[PDB]
Amino acid sequence: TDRVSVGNLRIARVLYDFVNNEALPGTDIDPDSFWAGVDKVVADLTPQNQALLNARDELQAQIDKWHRRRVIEPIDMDAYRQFLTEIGYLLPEPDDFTITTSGVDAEITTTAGPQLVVPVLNARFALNAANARWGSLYDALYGTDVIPETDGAEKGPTYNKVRGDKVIAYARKFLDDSVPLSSGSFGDATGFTVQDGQLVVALPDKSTGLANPGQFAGYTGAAESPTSVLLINHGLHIEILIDPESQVGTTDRAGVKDVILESAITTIMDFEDSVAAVDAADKVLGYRNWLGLNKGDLAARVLNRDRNYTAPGGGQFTLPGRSLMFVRNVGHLMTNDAIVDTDGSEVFEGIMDALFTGLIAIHGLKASDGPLINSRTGSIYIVKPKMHGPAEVAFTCELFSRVEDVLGLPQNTMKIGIMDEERRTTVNLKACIKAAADRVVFINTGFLDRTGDEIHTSMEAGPMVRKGTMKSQPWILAYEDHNVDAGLAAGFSGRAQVGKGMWTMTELMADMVETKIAQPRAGASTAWVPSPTAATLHALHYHQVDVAAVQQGLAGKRRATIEQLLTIPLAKELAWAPDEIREEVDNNCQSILGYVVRWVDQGVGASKVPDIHDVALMEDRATLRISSQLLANWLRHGVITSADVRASLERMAPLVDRQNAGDVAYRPMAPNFDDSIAFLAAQELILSGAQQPNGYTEPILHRRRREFKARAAE
């Protein structure tokens, strides 16, 4: 064996060496003490971790039985709610309280804006996300369908001036809307100067200042001929770049070259659903990128420095050039063979992530190679996914407390971003926030996982509505409102983020700009975006909507009831025709196959995957949880047959093969289906779906990826 013995633990050498040689030096933590800490923490907390997982199983069994002994279906909410209380699923709600989390950075407590999520295993994307704090509005407008590609305004091999003019006009309107002039429009501006600390905008017939001069934050270059002008609106910066000697500046009435927006204020570096990591080698690749990010020296090419400005009165200041980083650890379920015990049993991966990502995060609290890169207030920001109820939140907090001791960190250094993405957390949300009242820095509606959990929890109740129908069901609308209500009641305004979910259609940016505005209008101080380009565009929404004002107006409102949260998305009688059934089956089988083939064969856990209609979607593993559970549910209830499923997987497999003329590493699934580990994975996810704990896909996916890896070696 190649493993290292530390107490009852047998640690993969690749991980032992990474930690000793790369993660530990510079933290002043004694290596022998760290490893003894790992052994003791794993030993002490493993049984409670296991008890919590068994408790999930016991509750689900009781709910399964409840539905199976019933035959009514007008569905008595009073009985159901009573039952959930008796069995300890629905817990009493505690008295009102206010969170006490402290030492949190301004980006989280105060600033409303986009939050970018990226797979930590991809160094290039991680670097780009960290750098996405600032982004070009002209690039985002020109490069996407926000400016329609109508006749004459199409993207070509080279710069189309007509399209560029539309870009310019769009951005001028944004300026008028966000940082209005006392009179006239930015559209007619002819120059910018700074006089007596005041911004002066030259118009054809006169000059003018800002309607609100306080929105003038600074500038670069000579006041009398500035190279840029910095503005602020709703706590977010906007920079007008001035350069008549540029290809766009040359044609512009004021010589404006670009408008840069502060965009991805924060970024979540993901170890969970957007990555595929099934062994020590995979975890180390992730840990090493997270290490490079925190040390400031990740190069795939490099991290940006801070931005220098001149203040209005003429003094100097700087603004952060980087997105403030969270890390999303995995949740309570999975083990990983990066460490096993003397019996060969794998160690819980969530416990390992807290220890290792926490250790590594110490570097981001110290000086780089310049200033320290991450939290100036001294916090480590960890997103904890897939928790079920307040005992699991408490357990996470206790894990973090124990890790802080191993690491020599002050108590409550390790903050928690709570995913509200499981039903038992949803209906006990206030108690969940309370369990973490001194650690919580966000709540976020992870709606894809939540949908997966909704289907599995009520699997035995009856057939569910179609996948596309789910986003508009009463349960989910109530879930979204309830989340906001609970956060604001716990005093999140000015203290912690209230967050909403991901826009998955990466190429549909016009649609994004039209519709995602709903989230800040609902009082969310942040929401997830798939890319730096999407961060720049979503930033527009925060300039249009005053989230702080919206949150204050929502104060003390209760807009969702428990009954509404508990409304199971059962399909009504005779809901669909035979063609519509096949359309839905095909939809889900294509979604599963498209995602699974990249996961199992190439270890990619997130990417732009074309759907059955060739719309490009970037989703994490939770989309697979939904599709596999929905098909399992339809099979469970006789909506479809096992031949229907087989036929659909067969029909969709070559279409996915074709869609993956994307290139070099792709192996087709058809026609040798039973020779494709990825094809068999997809089939197994559906046919064993009903029996997976809470519908989780990881046990099957991890097994199949490891199988693939093992074959690729021999």
Residues designated catalytic: 328, 620
499 forms bridges with which residues in the sheet?
444, 526
> Applying CB under 6 A, does 604 fall inside the site for ligand 4Z1?
no
Scanning residues 20 to 79, which ones bind Mg ion (CB under 5 A)? none
> Applying CB under 5 A, does 622 fall inside the site for Mg ion?
yes
> Applying CB under 6 A, does 460 fall inside the site for ligand 4Z1?
no
Q: Which region, judged by CB under 5 A, interacts with Mg ion, from 71-79, 294-302, 543-551, 602-610?
A: 543-551
**CA distances (Å), 416 to each of 410, 436, 497, 601, in order?**
15, 8, 11, 33
Query: CA nearest 268: which of 50, 100, 416, 402?
Result: 416
> Applying CB under 6 A, does 601 fall inside the site for ligand 4Z1?
no
Which lies closer to ligand 4Z1 via its Cβ, residue 253 or residue 608? Answer: 608
Phi/psi region, residue 466 (left: phi>0; alpha: psi -120 to 50; beta: rest), is beta
CA distance 348 to 337: 9
Which lies closer to ligand 4Z1 via its Cβ, residue 273 or residue 337? Answer: 273
Phi/psi region, residue 663 (left: phi>0; alpha: psi -120 to 50; beta: rest), is left
> Applying CB under 6 A, does 296 fall inside the site for ligand 4Z1?
no
Q: Which of ligand 4Z1, Mg ion, none does 546 bind, CB closer than 5 to 8 A by kind?
A: Mg ion
Burial group, residue 104, by CB count within 10 angstroms (0-12, 13-18, 19+): buried
DSSP string for residues in 560-627: --HHHHT---BPPTT---HHHHHHHHHHHHHHHHHHHHHHHHH-B----EE-TTS-EE---THHHHHH
Which lies closer to Mg ion via its Cβ, residue 391 or residue 622? Answer: 622
> Applying CB under 6 A, does 421 fall inside the site for ligand 4Z1?
yes
Given 619, 644, 684, 698, the residue binding ligand 4Z1 (CB under 6 A): 619
Does residue 157 have a cis peptide bond before it, meaning omega lies within 30 degrees of 0? no
Given 349, 392, 449, 584, the residue binding Mg ion (CB under 5 A): 449
Give every CB contact of residue 410 below 8 A, 6+ residues apart in sequence.
378, 404
> Applying CB under 6 A, does 453 fall inside the site for ligand 4Z1?
no
> Applying CB under 6 A, does 354 fall inside the site for ligand 4Z1?
no
Minimum CB separation of residue 545 from ligand 4Z1 in Å reads 22
Total residues binding ligand 4Z1 (CB under 6 A): 18
> Applying CB under 6 A, does 117 fall inside the site for ligand 4Z1?
yes
Written as one letter, the residue type at 590 is Q
Scanning residues 523 to 552, which ones bind ligand 4Z1 (CB under 6 A)? 530
Cβ atoms 640, 576 nearer than 8 A: no
Helices then strands, counting H and E runs in the chain, come out as 24, 24
DSSP string for residues in 387-450: --SHHHHHHHHHHHHHHHHHHTPPTT-EEEEEEE-SHHHHTTHHHHHHHTTTTEEEEEE-HHHH
Cβ atoms 563, 81 nearer than 8 A: yes
Given 403, 545, 606, 681, the residue binding ligand 4Z1 (CB under 6 A): 606
Minimum CB separation of residue 307 from ligand 4Z1 in Å reads 27
Which lies closer to Mg ion via its Cβ, residue 546 or residue 650? Answer: 546
Per-position x/- string for 391-430, each x denoting binding to Mg ion as judged by CB under 5 A, each - no binding:
------------------------------x---------
Given 111, 263, 267, 274, the residue binding ligand 4Z1 (CB under 6 A): 274
Scanning residues 480 to 519, which ones bind ligand 4Z1 (CB under 6 A)? 501-502, 504
> Applying CB under 5 A, does 546 fall inside the site for Mg ion?
yes
Q: Which of ligand 4Z1, Mg ion, none does 584 bind, CB closer than 5 to 8 A by kind?
A: none
Residue with tokens 């797979």: 119
Tell me 132's DSSP state: G
> Applying CB under 5 A, does 176 fall inside the site for Mg ion?
no
> Applying CB under 6 A, does 448 fall inside the site for ligand 4Z1?
yes
HEC string of 457-494 equals HCCCCCCECCHHHHHHCHHHHHHHHHHHHHHHHCCCCC
> Applying CB under 6 A, does 446 fall inside the site for ligand 4Z1?
yes
Q: Which of Mg ion, ligand 4Z1, none does 274 bind, CB closer than 5 to 8 A by kind?
A: ligand 4Z1
- Residues forming the site for ligand 4Z1 (CB under 6 A): 117, 273-274, 419, 421, 446-449, 501-502, 504, 530, 606, 618-620, 622
Residues engaged in binding Mg ion (CB under 5 A): 421, 446, 449, 546, 622
